[PDB]
């Protein structure tokens, strides 16, 4: 499994998708994950939640017409889901936070 902020982000530059451990958030719910009881890892076990349109509501990240931003988490392994998440656009620009999307700083 390929969950640093290294890995996932020379991972997205090369092959343009996320490694094999990403779930959709629906996906997992559809596996039996209840975010409330931080199951993933009983559920969906070595995966991540990750794939999921990022909406960019406050700009904080670079718009662009046409550019899309998605996001995946970072350093999961069980329990509770932490605050780390990588967020990648259609054009490869890889940012991150570690403070559930406060603040973001370019990683790639």
Known sequence: V???FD???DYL???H???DNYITKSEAQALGWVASKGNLADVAPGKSIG???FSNREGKLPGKSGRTWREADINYTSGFRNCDRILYS????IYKTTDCYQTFTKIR
């Open 17 to 19: 998708k996320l490694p």
């Open 13 to 15: 530059q090369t092959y």
């Open 7 to 9: 890995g996932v982000a």
């Open 90 to 93: 259609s054009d490869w620009l």
């Open 2 to 4: 390929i969950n640093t």
């Open 51 to 53: 794939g999921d349109i």
